[PDB]
Write an enzyme that holds these catalytic residues in place. Structure first.
Site, PDB file in Angstrom:
ATOM      1  N   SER A  15       0.854  -1.175   0.000  1.00  0.00           N
ATOM      2  CA  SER A  15       0.000   0.000   0.000  1.00  0.00           C
ATOM      3  C   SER A  15       0.894   1.230   0.000  1.00  0.00           C
ATOM      4  CB  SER A  15      -0.894  -0.011   1.236  1.00  0.00           C
ATOM      5  OG  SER A  15      -1.733  -1.151   1.226  1.00  0.00           O
TER       6      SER A  15
ATOM      7  N   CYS B 141      -7.634  -0.718   7.123  1.00  0.00           N
ATOM      8  CA  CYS B 141      -6.512  -1.321   6.415  1.00  0.00           C
ATOM      9  C   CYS B 141      -5.671  -2.195   7.330  1.00  0.00           C
ATOM     10  CB  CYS B 141      -5.617  -0.231   5.815  1.00  0.00           C
ATOM     11  SG  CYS B 141      -4.144  -0.882   4.968  1.00  0.00           S
TER      12      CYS B 141
ATOM     13  N   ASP C 123      -9.045  -2.188   2.829  1.00  0.00           N
ATOM     14  CA  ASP C 123      -7.830  -2.530   2.104  1.00  0.00           C
ATOM     15  C   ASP C 123      -7.142  -3.495   3.054  1.00  0.00           C
ATOM     16  OD1 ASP C 123      -5.038  -2.365   0.941  1.00  0.00           O
ATOM     17  OD2 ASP C 123      -6.041  -0.846  -0.285  1.00  0.00           O
TER      18      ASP C 123
ATOM     19  N   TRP D 105      -5.370  -7.518   3.869  1.00  0.00           N
ATOM     20  CA  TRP D 105      -4.603  -8.618   3.316  1.00  0.00           C
ATOM     21  C   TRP D 105      -4.236  -9.608   4.417  1.00  0.00           C
ATOM     22  CZ3 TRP D 105      -2.542  -3.560   3.591  1.00  0.00           C
ATOM     23  CH2 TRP D 105      -1.494  -3.379   4.514  1.00  0.00           C
TER      24      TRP D 105
HETATM   25  C1  LIG Z   1      -3.265  -5.481  -1.751  1.00  0.00           C
HETATM   26  C2  LIG Z   1      -2.116  -5.830  -0.798  1.00  0.00           C
HETATM   27  C3  LIG Z   1      -1.415  -4.800  -0.089  1.00  0.00           C
HETATM   28  C4  LIG Z   1      -0.318  -5.091   0.828  1.00  0.00           C
HETATM   29  N1  LIG Z   1       0.287  -4.006   1.458  1.00  0.00           N
HETATM   30  C5  LIG Z   1       1.327  -4.318   2.335  1.00  0.00           C
HETATM   31  C6  LIG Z   1       1.973  -3.196   3.002  1.00  0.00           C
HETATM   32  O1  LIG Z   1       1.685  -2.003   2.842  1.00  0.00           O
HETATM   33  N2  LIG Z   1       3.021  -3.576   3.900  1.00  0.00           N
HETATM   34  C7  LIG Z   1       3.471  -4.832   4.190  1.00  0.00           C
HETATM   35  O2  LIG Z   1       4.375  -5.076   4.987  1.00  0.00           O
HETATM   36  N3  LIG Z   1       2.866  -5.872   3.540  1.00  0.00           N
HETATM   37  C8  LIG Z   1       1.819  -5.668   2.630  1.00  0.00           C
HETATM   38  N4  LIG Z   1       1.211  -6.739   1.971  1.00  0.00           N
HETATM   39  C9  LIG Z   1       1.784  -8.094   2.283  1.00  0.00           C
HETATM   40  C10 LIG Z   1       2.873  -8.050   1.072  1.00  0.00           C
HETATM   41  O3  LIG Z   1       2.321  -8.067  -0.316  1.00  0.00           O
HETATM   42  C11 LIG Z   1       3.738  -9.392   1.170  1.00  0.00           C
HETATM   43  O4  LIG Z   1       2.901 -10.574   1.208  1.00  0.00           O
HETATM   44  C12 LIG Z   1       4.672  -9.478   2.388  1.00  0.00           C
HETATM   45  O5  LIG Z   1       5.518  -8.312   2.352  1.00  0.00           O
HETATM   46  C13 LIG Z   1       5.493 -10.655   2.426  1.00  0.00           C
HETATM   47  O6  LIG Z   1       6.194 -10.950   1.232  1.00  0.00           O
HETATM   48  P1  LIG Z   1       7.504 -11.663   1.161  1.00  0.00           P
HETATM   49  O7  LIG Z   1       7.793 -11.770  -0.297  1.00  0.00           O
HETATM   50  O8  LIG Z   1       8.606 -10.987   1.924  1.00  0.00           O
HETATM   51  O9  LIG Z   1       7.075 -13.033   1.861  1.00  0.00           O
HETATM   52  P2  LIG Z   1       6.906 -14.367   1.143  1.00  0.00           P
HETATM   53  O10 LIG Z   1       8.207 -14.923   0.659  1.00  0.00           O
HETATM   54  O11 LIG Z   1       5.836 -14.278   0.124  1.00  0.00           O
HETATM   55  O12 LIG Z   1       6.444 -15.251   2.264  1.00  0.00           O
HETATM   56  C14 LIG Z   1       5.212 -15.050   2.989  1.00  0.00           C
HETATM   57  C15 LIG Z   1       4.626 -16.359   3.500  1.00  0.00           C
HETATM   58  O13 LIG Z   1       5.521 -16.886   4.509  1.00  0.00           O
HETATM   59  C16 LIG Z   1       4.744 -17.621   5.483  1.00  0.00           C
HETATM   60  N5  LIG Z   1       5.065 -17.133   6.861  1.00  0.00           N
HETATM   61  C17 LIG Z   1       5.309 -15.878   7.411  1.00  0.00           C
HETATM   62  N6  LIG Z   1       5.578 -15.889   8.774  1.00  0.00           N
HETATM   63  C18 LIG Z   1       5.498 -17.226   9.088  1.00  0.00           C
HETATM   64  C19 LIG Z   1       5.664 -17.989  10.314  1.00  0.00           C
HETATM   65  N7  LIG Z   1       5.971 -17.400  11.515  1.00  0.00           N
HETATM   66  N8  LIG Z   1       5.489 -19.371  10.187  1.00  0.00           N
HETATM   67  C20 LIG Z   1       5.186 -20.077   9.063  1.00  0.00           C
HETATM   68  N9  LIG Z   1       5.009 -19.464   7.845  1.00  0.00           N
HETATM   69  C21 LIG Z   1       5.179 -18.020   7.918  1.00  0.00           C
HETATM   70  C22 LIG Z   1       3.265 -17.524   5.051  1.00  0.00           C
HETATM   71  O14 LIG Z   1       2.845 -18.730   4.328  1.00  0.00           O
HETATM   72  C23 LIG Z   1       3.297 -16.234   4.249  1.00  0.00           C
HETATM   73  O15 LIG Z   1       2.185 -16.258   3.358  1.00  0.00           O
HETATM   74  C24 LIG Z   1       0.076  -6.509   1.022  1.00  0.00           C
HETATM   75  C25 LIG Z   1      -0.633  -7.542   0.303  1.00  0.00           C
HETATM   76  C26 LIG Z   1      -1.683  -7.239  -0.569  1.00  0.00           C
HETATM   77  C27 LIG Z   1      -2.346  -8.437  -1.259  1.00  0.00           C
END
Ligand SMILES: Cc1cc2nc3c(=O)[nH]c(=O)nc-3n(C[C@H](O)[C@H](O)[C@H](O)COP(=O)(O)OP(=O)(O)OC[C@H]3O[C@@H](n4cnc5c(N)ncnc54)[C@H](O)[C@@H]3O)c2cc1C
Ligand SMILES: NC(=O)c1ccc[n+]([C@@H]2O[C@H](COP(=O)([O-])OP(=O)(O)OC[C@H]3O[C@@H](n4cnc5c(N)ncnc54)[C@H](OP(=O)(O)O)[C@@H]3O)[C@@H](O)[C@H]2O)c1
EC number: 1.6.2.4
Length: 435
Positions: free
Chosen positions: A215, A387, A432, A434
């Protein structure tokens, strides 16, 4: 299999994909319009830690979109195409006994199929594993099914076939050993050391590396040439003695706005328009509820409302209901919010510190305690915004507004549910959220 391998032992560098999502050389030769297929490589001008504590890492990034012609509004989302950890990619090449720098193409055996390749080709295995493939999430059963044939130790082949099967014990083992233990492909290769699949087949089996959305935490009225992100880094220890890292957040955390030898940290991105928007009239009051990183879009909203006041425009009440664990641990934008409050941009700054006492104190508790004024604002046409966490927070907050309207509105629960739902239809209650 679906694709056949064609190794290009002597191909011109200019013909090789290096991570671009669309057209060859589009990352290096940037020309508008920029969008999902032609993302803009924004320079990271700021990357700073927001939290005071060390429990987690919450960061604020500013992406320079100057000369991109990209337009955005507070409330919109910014998508980024990340890169996997180079050390992890290296470990995969090593354990597989593969030369990651080999350039090749995987071509669909069905020459008539629209899907000619699994990802941009020609490209090296290193590039595919870094920019095009998901190598961190738990592999699906179908992947395990195809991989079993490459485990030369019978017991290991049996284990993989079992977890990929539909047997009762097989499903429980997959759930516990792969999903819950969060075992990624490298973890499986390490725990089943006899597994030696050819790297090209592995590249055909793994899912594509997806864009991550954030966001936008800035107002284009204040920062037309910069898109800000507020994010919490994902990093945890698994039930299998490993440390898993979120792909996009650790990649962003590592983006050094400087970097010796100069070199500006670039982030391939694009803007996805949302319907999350401030009221058309600045005089219309706004109630914002966003605990944790859910405060993101609201930093932009407040920036905008403050800018409007600074310009000399009349602005309605602007209230923020924020929440964090501890005031001296993870109070995001504490300084900025305090200033906005002192200057009058933020009419009210209500913060719920959930772990500063034995029991939980959340944003909805503060909302209920402010039921009188909130009802007044709502009846007056105020816009409500929520949000953050869609799992429990969003629902709890919605139920709190139901109760507020039911009580102060002197109506039945059902009538209150209808009242709030009409607000949503009229665009006065926006979400908003997620997971
Ligand atoms: C419309 C929208 C807006 C968003 N806005 C924001 C924002 O403003 N700020 C923000 O920080 N994020 C936001 N997100 C979340 C963001 O898109 C990412 O999903 C997040 O940053 C994580 O991505 P990553 O690639 O680092 O993690 P990834 O590599 O994709 O891994 C995440 C996955 O790791 C696993 N996981 C996490 N912690 C644990 C745990 N303790 N134990 C076991 N499994 C675990 C889960 O399965 C999780 O789904 C938003 C999502 C959407 C859909
Ligand atoms: O960023 P982030 O995602 O990592 O946020 P987060 O830190 O997990 O959470 C942000 C804030 O939301 C609180 N919270 C948790 N469950 C909630 C609920 N159902 N309703 C309202 N507030 C809730 C948290 O308190 P707790 O973590 O103390 O429950 C915390 O103070």
């Amino acid at each position: 299999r679906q694709y056949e391998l064609v190794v290009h032992t002597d191909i011109d560098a200019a013909k090789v994909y290096m991570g671009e999502m669309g057209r060859l050389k589009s990352y290096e030769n940037q020309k508008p319009p920029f969008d999902a297929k032609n993302p803009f490589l924004a320079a990271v001008t700021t990357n700073r830690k927001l939290n005071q504590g060390t429990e987690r890492h919450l960061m604020h990034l500013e992406l320079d979109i100057s000369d991109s012609k990209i337009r955005y509004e507070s409330g919109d989302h910014v998508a980024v195409y990340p890169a996997n950890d180079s050390a992890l990619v290296n470990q995969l090449g090593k354990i597989l006994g593969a030369d990651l720098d080999v350039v090749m193409s995987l071509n669909n055996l069905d020459e008539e199929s629209n899907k000619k390749h699994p990802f941009p080709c020609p490209t090296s295995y290193r590039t595919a594993l870094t920019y095009y493939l998901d190598i961190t999430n738990p592999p699906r059963t179908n992947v395990l099914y195809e991989l079993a044939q490459y485990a030369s130790e019978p017991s290991e082949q049996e284990l993989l076939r079992k977890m990929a099967s539909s047997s009762g014990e097989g499903k429980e083992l997959y759930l516990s050993w792969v999903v819950e233990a969060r075992r990624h492909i490298l973890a499986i290769l390490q725990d089943c050391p006899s597994l030696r699949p050819p790297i090209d087949h592995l590249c055909e089996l793994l899912p594509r590396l997806q864009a991550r959305y954030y966001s936008i935490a800035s107002s284009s009225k204040v920062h037309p040439n910069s898109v800000h992100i507020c994010a919490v880094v994902v990093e945890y220890e698994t039930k299998a003695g490993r440390i898993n890292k979120g792909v996009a957040t650790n990649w962003l955390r590592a983006k050094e706005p400087v970097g010796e030898n100069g070199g500006r940290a670039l982030v391939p991105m694009f803007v996805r328009k949302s319907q999350f928007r401030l009221p058309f009239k600045a005089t219309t009051p706004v109630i914002m509820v966003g605990p944790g990183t859910g405060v993101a879009p609201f930093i932009g909203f407040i920036q905008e409302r403050a800018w409007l006041r600074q310009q000399g425009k009349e602005v309605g009440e602007t209230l923020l209901y924020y929440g964090c664990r501890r005031s001296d641990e993870d109070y995001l934008y504490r300084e900025e919010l305090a200033q906005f409050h002192r200057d009058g941009a933020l009419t009210q700054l209500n913060v719920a510190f959930s772990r500063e006492q034995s029991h939980k104190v959340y944003v909805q508790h503060l909302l209920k305690q402010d039921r009188e004024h909130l009802w007044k604002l709502i009846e007056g046409g105020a816009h409500i915004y929520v949000c953050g966490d869609a799992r429990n927070m969003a629902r709890d907050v919605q139920n709190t507004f139901y109760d507020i309207v039911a009580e102060l509105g002197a109506m039945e629960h059902a009538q209150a549910v209808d009242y709030i739902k009409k607000l949503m239809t009229k665009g006065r209650y926006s979400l908003d959220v997620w997971s």
